[PDB]
């Protein structure tokens, strides 16, 4: 929620095998998390996994 933000840890792999990672605070729920994941992956031509409380909740692979 807005009053209790969800902390999502994103882990990304570029096609090169190089990695990136970010913590993002989100006020929404499933749809937002998925959209943000897809956008992160697509913009970066990457595989991106979303984690909440150390558990994988979604992933999107745009490495091709």
């Amino acid at each position: 929620s807005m009053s209790k933000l969800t902390k999502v840890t994103f882990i990304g792999w570029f096609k090169s095998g190089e990695m990136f990672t970010k913590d993002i605070m989100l006020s929404g729920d499933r749809e937002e998390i998925e959209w943000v994941t897809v956008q992160l992956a697509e913009v970066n031509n990457a595989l991106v996994k979303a984690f909440i409380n150390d558990e994988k909740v979604f992933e999107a692979d745009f490495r091709g």
Copy 2:
């Protein structure tokens, strides 16, 4: 090769800046635990170790 696994480490410096490392290790958990602790202690960081996207160890030296 059957004795090896790729392990994904995520780390947080005390500043909150993050790092993430993909490291091939022995599949035996004692080794993965040792590397988790070493990475955390050397970098004065919180480090989490993931295998097959499951968190298996965590060490905090912030």
